[PDB]
Subunit: 654 residues, 3 copies
């Protein structure tokens, strides 16, 4: 009854699913109780063929039937699911629903200014997707090509992604907050033949330069042959390169409202999504089609308890896996409307999220703890102004959610009447790994609870490398076998894929996360064990930010570390040592701007600390732990004298 | 029994199908009576999924089954049929028949000179199509490409179209009567990668310059990488560009007699066919595969009453939709022989058609009224010299058929023993829209009778735009929902497609024709309500002929209108205003022959000082039509003219110059 | 009981299958006796659709079902099998077995040095093939492309062929014994986009220059865009051209262990294999996919009596059809392990073959008579040192096997306990044509016995061209209808295909071989009737060797003929007439052939003469040269001799120069 290792679980009462949840449920739940889930989970692990086989035939529409459910091993890096099958993601996300009820809402597009909001039905979505795919097809985009998308979180982003997939091409979405440097690396790694973007962006009421950043990147992108440009603001001063750039509205008007979808294999790549690891250069994560789609449909249906009558509002961005899986593919596969919100939770006020939920009577809400911390700070009064009684499932993602934020989230938003789903997963996992199923799994505030279907979670002693038997344990979180939506490779760098996920603990998948398992079997995520920082739910690499600082030729060496931040959860502090050859305060700001243009404004360090030399080991490498403690005011060795200078530089410049 | 609006229907007795028709039928008819047709028609309109679903699985062979029969709406321009299905037109037209009876005749090629006539069995056609597709495939022609065909109406034209479609590419046939300019425009719009043509042509005994006109156009066609040239006359003086042009016989000898067909989606384009509308620039009409093929097979089977034992002789050209649907796809889909005639109805004599029918015992004849009027003038005596007792279905297409031509066609050709099927349809419709089913629907000479399966015809008041309820009515002819073989878009210009067909009357498909519906429900086609003239059965735009005359820099403005002609049915008179006499008229007529082609030349060019223009500024063509039709005394209204003095000059110029 | 024509058959007792064979069979045989085979053969000939239809569904896994079993005729050259079907060769040879037993042995790779031997399971093979196919796909290699392979007989050669086929591309394997000249002709004829090779080879303990020969040819190969190089020896002195050449291990490491296979049509080309005929230029023989694969599985299963528990050791090379069909496709289709041997039967000793058989308990052995003659001469004592009791089927291929070698093979290798299968077939047949089924057909030493399923063998009188009725007859060996694995065309040269195989005797397939049929129906292969020489089982063209000698401009004319050799069966003698040009020059010409074709095609002896026996027209009397070389220069049979005095110079030159 007492835990010696998993201290989070001591004195934590199980929080049942409120009765109001089952009152608001439109139909019978998909799973009755935890016991039924236990048996379903056991079958998903002991008998994947008998479990996912029928579920694949049920939830997905196939152009060609598969003959083998599961193939390959984790250790050999040859995992494959539903081999021999053929299908198309846009048909499963659009066509099959449009043919049934073409007037059912599909994309609920809430623009930055609500005066620009609109709704696309599945019939509308089919025609728009078909037109964009018709444009791309006429440009030579064929199966096996990759098409980059640099768009904000609006309806055009969803249309672009589905139009690319309709042709059998893989879309590589680039988060609109990246700079020309990040756009350049991603476009050239995938050798994209085309790019879809817009003239300008509207977020928080402020206009962003989108097309100018594209033009800036495309001078080093010889593979991009044509660019489709959407008139978001219709600014007449935005220049289009003659012979390369063409207008969305102009080109789509030349093509009809239906284009046949292209059948692809189950294991044909659906999309690339470049993620940051302890790598220095972002690596292109590649996901299959059938495996990924099932994971999106399966998790969305069961973890969130999504029914045909439901409305899902994932407050995320398609530039990250959360927008991919649970704003686009998850809900559209199940045929339900999905709310696509372009702006911020603060514009025009801090009741923007709740006005949207009330406006469309959304039944499911999915956001990162960073927004909850902000809205607790500056938006508690706005929540009571709106009717949130349509909600019954509330989800958290991207970051650890403190028990206190869990309570605030449950009370002030859920009114002690909704189920909270702390969903743990990764870009590489495609869909949820560990999460409490809505209406099934009781909560422990701050825990993700039980693994999901097909995930045989395990803890590994980092020192010995041996799987830890028994509960009340801590260690590195690993998966003992591959699952349908697991990422299949790193684009054209499968050795890096193997070295990162399969080789560190042979026979297992290495998540890069630490976690603990208590006597009840619940998993408590501890955080990353590598050089990855979670700034406001956005995965960042300390190595990537350091390399950005090094691009400024005024820097000799740089060291970036992550510290606790009470709003962004975790913040990046950059320690920079300059070479030989004025205005120290002015130079700090130069380095911050250096990161904003190399990676992007969101990856800027909170503070840049200029030092004389960095604390370096006897060998010569940087001990970041000294920087971590000094930065977090916990400052209690080839150069043991520098440590005093580090503390003073931080005390003065911070 | 009396009509106040549909005057054509007054005092017109129903003309039943002669008993000899049912005697000559090889088997039981496909539909018994009008009662069964009414019930089938009702289902095709109220339950398209339950009607066309089974018919598609029956008449067409599928590589992949379809999951949805019908999708999209007319108003949104997203019509789709048999979604999810995969098939191949050449497999449906050739292979499946070659596998059953490889020695059954497929193409009965009657050449211009009968000494060059021959017959291709379905087995022969498979070998030739596979060889031509093997050549094209080796040249890089893959699915999604377009291949142009500039060939006369002979067996090589048919092989090229099927070979292009066998690879999943869309063929764009260019009528052999077009000029280097017309070839140039069509090739560049579709961005064709290859071209199939021949060295020279034989039509009416006269040699035509085929390859020479291609070379003339191809200097401005940068997308065409290779050209396959057939030795029709084997004239050694015909030049081939090294590295670009290759010979049919030389290259096809390099490849085997079977090539796998390429599966395409139901809604993948089968072909482009550039048609003339009231737009000025020819637009590439695009047809799907499964939808179009079914429409061709369904209409050919039911409207013409085609059985496996029958032989069809469509006296048309693959350069137009009539040759597309009812000389190639219609009959070949059903597995029956099709007579491909290369020459003219007058060479070597005016009994050429009837000698062909007698030679092969053709059971079905399909021609335009223009030929009937010509043969009435100079070939009536020849008809009796030949045994035409094998015929039982006689078809008319392209033009309105006058009651007198209907009687002449029934008596001297059909011997008052055949069914006459006046088939109304368009390039954009793919197959028949309104026609009397052979052996089922009684005729009214000059009427097309009832709509066909899946066609919910309607009349719209041009002024109000409201559907006209009830009979004894006239107005714009519209279709209330899309049908399987309806054209799906205009190539790379879907906005023009929408603006032309779907937007004028939202919720409907706008045919561009006026028509009347009588108390019996029969439709009487009145003619085009837009600037389209039917010159010798070939659809033409007055805007194209006007633009052709204006290219001659001696012309300031031009206005072309269509009037009745007793031989060609409708002729174009061109009114030209110069910027400053017989010789200049001859220059302008030749100007049209070089821009469009010899077939589109105006009947007469009338030089005038200035044209009748309205208050707004547009050319009042109705005055030009009336003056040309010798009705320049019942001019309904000239008070709308900014220059009512021009009318005096228009009448005098026409009276003086029309004879000269 | 006595033969007047087939003298080989006189006094030849039927040699029954030893009882130990049926003891060693893992299960009941696939066919019980000759009577059951006779009935099955009758159905394969009288009802191919009912015979091969079910067998195709049984032995092959289909992505799409076929609708027609058989199509086309021999005379029209449009043969096709299993039309409409779709499948993939690598899925049938690798994936479907890896999914069942991923750890079952697939490739038993015996390297030249046994220290480098290893075993790839079906799971291992899927990962290796998937990675190489992933590399090739990234280079743009898509369906319809051809990829050349210049590798020795090791596991990488098998992987390369399967990786190419996985993408829907056709692999064109180039035997590693060719020189840059032969590589050039094959690569440029197929327009290969890529090439898979290695840096150097290990054969007989000697290092071979592989990549150096590629670089020499590739300077004249503009179509090859990239080259994948395998580190066989890891020699750092082997140069790779930057931008074209890439390393096997480096590139495959970038891609995952599974890649989806690409479905192809039954009649989509699986591979090219350039064979030498009486033409002068090697012709690219093209084989279908489904038809070829079925032939490989069917013959391997039934003629060799292959069961799931068996191990096959085909002592051949993938550079020839024997390695294609019965070292790669045959066994892997059936899911059994196949031994891939890189070296020679003499390194490190002449018991190398038998050590391999004992090491892996191989149940089936398949080799050419040339190796048997070599091992009889210098390795007879080694055979008894090894346990060969696991064998039960012994196969002969490529050459006629003398009755004496048949006895030695049966006794010293089979211990008078195994079935001998003298398999007669060709590159163009894909799989066996005439062979004694293991455990079914009794043997006549030196005979191939009865035709196999679907092979309607026949004899044709060369003079009359008429099929020979009755037995005890001799003539040209022909097949009366096409069979599933029959070659479908010559790459981009179907006219040569027709002229070589279908046109000589219309209605039949002309094998190019003479044969005799005795009173029991057994076929006795007599040999090639054209200018083809069988040097050590490798088909060679005399015209190709003559053209190589003529490239040396020191030669005026050359004439190559084949003579009896007691080890290689047949050896090539070259008679060369110089212009103004002795021992050193003979070595120049021998090296000249080694430079154009390859060391294996080098003449055994080069005889310099003043002039060749030439006809009045200008032809070389080759029949005189054959007899003179075989010391039969008195039974010359000679009316066309324009220079009957040259014959004396030919005889003297041969008697003097053949030694030194
Ligand atoms: C068939 C094909 C060659 O037509 P298009 O060249 O696409 O031109 C279509 C136009 O032709 C005219 N029309 C065709 N058929 C008939 C008919 N039976 N009775 C009366 N008018 C007919 C109509 O004006 C139609 O809109
Ligand atoms: C199998 C492969 C290596 O053959 P190719 O290299 O294509 O040459 C084919 C020619 O080889 C000869 N032949 C093959 N098998 C035998 C045999 N069993 N008995 C006698 N002659 C045989 C024949 O002259 C055949 O036409
Ligand atoms: Cl299954
Ligand atoms: Cl259906
Ligand atoms: Cl069958």
């Amino acid at each position: 009854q007492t835990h010696n290792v998993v201290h989070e679980a001591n004195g934590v009462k199980l929080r049942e699913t409120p009765k109001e949840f089952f009152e608001r449920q439109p139909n019978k739940g998909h799973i009755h109780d935890v016991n039924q889930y236990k048996q379903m989970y056991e079958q998903s692990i002991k008998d994947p063929q008998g479990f996912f086989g029928p579920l694949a035939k049920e939830l997905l529409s196939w152009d060609h039937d598969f003959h083998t459910v599961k193939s390959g091993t984790l250790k050999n890096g040859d995992a494959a699911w539903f081999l021999g099958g053929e299908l198309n993601a846009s048909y499963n996300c659009v066509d099959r629903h449009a043919f049934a009820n073409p007037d059912k809402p599909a994309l609920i597009c809430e623009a930055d200014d609500e005066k620009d909001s609109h709704i696309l039905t599945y019939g509308d979505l089919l025609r728009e997707v078909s037109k964009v795919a018709g444009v791309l097809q006429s440009w030579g985009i064929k199966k096996g090509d990759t098409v980059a998308v640099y768009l904000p979180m609006n309806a055009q982003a969803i249309i672009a992604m589905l139009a690319i997939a309709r042709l059998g091409a893989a879309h590589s979405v680039i988060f609109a907050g990246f700079s020309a440097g990040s756009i350049k690396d991603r476009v050239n790694d995938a050798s994209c033949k085309a790019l879809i973007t817009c003239d300008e962006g509207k977020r928080g009421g402020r206009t962003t330069n989108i097309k100018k950043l594209c033009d800036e990147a495309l001078v080093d992108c010889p593979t991009v042959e044509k660019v489709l440009v959407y008139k978001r603001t219709n600014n007449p001063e935005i220049h289009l390169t003659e012979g390369r750039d063409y207008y969305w509205d102009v080109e789509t008007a030349k093509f009809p409202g239906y284009l046949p979808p292209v059948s692809v294999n189950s294991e044909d790549p659906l999309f690339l999504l470049y993620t940051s690891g302890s790598t220095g250069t972002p690596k292109g994560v590649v996901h299959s089609t059938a495996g990924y789609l099932l994971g999106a449909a399966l998790s969305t249906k069961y973890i969130f308890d999504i029914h045909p009558e439901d409305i899902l509002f994932t407050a995320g961005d398609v530039g990250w896996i959360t927008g991919h899986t649970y704003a686009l593919y998850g809900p559209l596969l199940l045929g339900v409307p999905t709310i696509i919100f372009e702006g911020t939770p603060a514009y025009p006020d801090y009741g923007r999220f709740w006005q949207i939920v009330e406006k469309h009577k959304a039944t499911h809400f999915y956001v990162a703890p960073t927004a909850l911390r902000l809205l607790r700070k500056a938006g508690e009064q706005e929540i009571a102004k709106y009717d949130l009684s349509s909600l019954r499932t509330l989800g958290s993602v991207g970051e650890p959610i403190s028990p206190d934020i869990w309570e605030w989230y449950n009370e002030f938003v859920g009114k002690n009447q909704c189920h909270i789903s702390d969903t743990y997963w990764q870009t590489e996992s495609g869909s949820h790994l560990i999460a409490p199923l809505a209406g099934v799994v009781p909560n422990k505030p701050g825990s993700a609870s039980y693994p999901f279907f097909g995930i045989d979670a395990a803890l590994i002693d980092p020192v010995t490398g041996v799987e830890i038997e028994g509960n009340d344990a801590e260690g590195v979180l690993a998966i003992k076998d591959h699952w349908p939506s697991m990422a299949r490779t790193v684009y054209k760098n499968h050795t890096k894929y193997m070295d990162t996920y399969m080789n560190p603990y042979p026979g297992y998948y290495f998540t890069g996360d630490g976690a603990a398992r208590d006597h009840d079997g619940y998993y408590w995520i501890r955080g990353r064990v590598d050089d990855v920082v979670n700034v406001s739910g956005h995965r960042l690499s300390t190595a990537e930010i350091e390399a950005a600082l090094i691009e400024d030729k005024k820097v000799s060496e740089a060291a970036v570390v992550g510290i606790h931040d009470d709003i962004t959860g975790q913040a990046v502090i950059a320690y920079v040592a300059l070479k030989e050859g004025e205005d120290s305060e002015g130079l700090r700001k130069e380095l911050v701007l250096q990161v904003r243009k190399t990676i992007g404004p969101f990856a800027a360090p909170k503070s840049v600390i200029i030092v004389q030399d960095l604390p370096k080991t006897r060998s010569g490498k940087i001990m970041r732990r000294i920087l971590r403690k000094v930065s977090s005011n916990e400052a209690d060795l080839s150069n043991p004298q520098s440590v005093e200078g580090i503390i003073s530089a931080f005390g003065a410049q911070f």
